[PDB]
Amino acid sequence: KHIQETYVAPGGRIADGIMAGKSPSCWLCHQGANIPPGAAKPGQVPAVLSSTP
Amino acid sequence: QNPIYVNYTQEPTDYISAESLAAMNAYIQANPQPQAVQVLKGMTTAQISAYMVAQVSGGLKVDCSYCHNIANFAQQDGYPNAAKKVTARKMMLMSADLNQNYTAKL
Ligand code: HEC
Numbered sequence: 001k002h003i004q005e006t007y008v009a010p011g012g013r014i015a016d017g018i019m020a021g022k023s024p025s026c027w028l029c030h031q032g033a034n035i036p037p038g039a040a041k042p043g044q045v046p047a048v049l050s051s052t053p
Numbered sequence: 054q055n056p057i058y059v060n061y062t063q064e065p066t067d068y069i070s071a072e073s074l075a076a077m078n079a080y081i082q083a084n085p086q087p088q089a090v091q092v093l094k095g096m097t098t099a100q101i102s103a104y105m106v107a108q109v110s111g112g113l114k115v116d117c118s119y120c121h122n123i124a125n126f127a128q129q130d131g132y133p134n135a136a137k138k139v140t141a142r143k144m145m146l147m148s149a150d151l152n153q154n155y156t157a158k159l
Pocket residue numbers: 024025026027028029030034035036039156159
């Protein structure tokens with residue numbers, strides 16, 4: 001819901017978002033699995049873009 | 054059994070040309086530290102290049118010239134692919150936020 005409200009159509013208007021008005025779904029990340037296949041293992045993403053800071 | 058992803062791989066990097074790799078190596082040799090970075094901090098040029106080979110341009114499966122200018126990796130505008138670079142920076146910030154205050158609660 002946060003992804004939809006902030007990056008798809010921020011303020012209610014699609015033109016300001018960074019996506020082409022494409023709302024997310026559970027399937028977009030989870031491609032049929034309980035852990036997304038494209039998820040990075042811990043310690044592999046640049047520290048500035050991780051959960052630790 | 055990729056050491057980065059759970060069930061994904063980028064290894065057959067046929068989408069990256071040889072000139073792109075040569076330019077990457079030359080830029081690494083000529084610049085030990087990054088020249089214009091606003092999001093990726095505390096990393097050398099070699100680490101940034103490794104990230105931009107493995108996860109960026111390996112998660113989209115595109116070439117280094119999709120967002121950059123091969124002659125100068127630090128250039129910001131003047132070529133017809135700058136909007137892609139701007140969107141990519143915004144998508145880096147979004148990912149940081151997303152896994153910083155939503156997957157840190159699990
Ligand atoms: C990409 C932004 C995702 C979206 C869209 C959805 N999920 Fe997800 N999910 C994502 C990650 C990176 C992880 C693992 C994080 C961790 O620290 O483990 C998950 C995990 C889950 C789980 C837990 C699975 C388990 O075995 O415990 C569940 C139950 C889950 N996610 C549910 C879920 C639902 C219902 C979604 C649609 C509303 C959904 N996720 C979307 C990444 C992403």
